[PDB]
């Protein structure tokens, strides 16, 4: 899913799904609200736990 | 809760609550029985998992 030309409030993401915590690389989930991005890509799938 | 003037045996903490593991900063849970502290503060609350 392509995400652009919008204001992203990542703090509300916790309300959408009951995930325990983020796993971010090269960035912190704490600072996501303070940054800008050219484009955002949301890749969704289902796998096994392991 | 203020904790002072007592001998603390942290190894028994695992019996009190069914928590999986500690999360310590600046110290290891392994060495807690070998140290002294001027005062201990226990802050209790309830939050969401995320
Ligand atoms: C997902 O959408 C449904 C209706 O399609 C809504 O009832 C539900 O609250 C939504 N989930 C969350 C976590 O808000
Ligand atoms: C907590 O206290 C109750 C009685 O108040 C006791 O039965 C129980 O064993 C205690 N919990 C633990 C983990 O020892």
From Swiss-Prot, chains A, B:
Residues 48-50 are annotated as: Integrin-binding motif. It comes from the Viruses. Binds to host ACE2. RBD also interacts with the N-linked glycan on 'Asn-90' of ACE2. Cleavage of S generates a polybasic C-terminal sequence on S1 that binds to host Neuropilin-1 (NRP1) and Neuropilin-2 (NRP2) receptors. Interacts with host integrin alpha-5/beta-1 (ITGA5:ITGB1) and with ACE2 in complex with integrin alpha-5/beta-1 (ITGA5:ITGB1). May interact via cytoplasmic c-terminus with M protein. May interact (via N-terminus) with host bilirubin and biliverdin, thereby preventing antibody binding to the SARS-CoV-2 spike NTD via an allosteric mechanism. Attaches the virion to the cell membrane by interacting with host receptor, initiating the infection. The major receptor is host ACE2. When S2/S2' has been cleaved, binding to the receptor triggers direct fusion at the cell membrane. When S2/S2' has not been cleaved, binding to the receptor results in internalization of the virus by endocytosis using host TFRC and GRM2 and leading to fusion of the virion membrane with the host endosomal membrane. Alternatively, may use NRP1/NRP2 and integrin as entry receptors. This is Spike protein S1. It comes from Severe acute respiratory syndrome coronavirus 2 (2019-nCoV). The gene is S. The chain holds residues 356 to 405 of 1273 of the full protein.
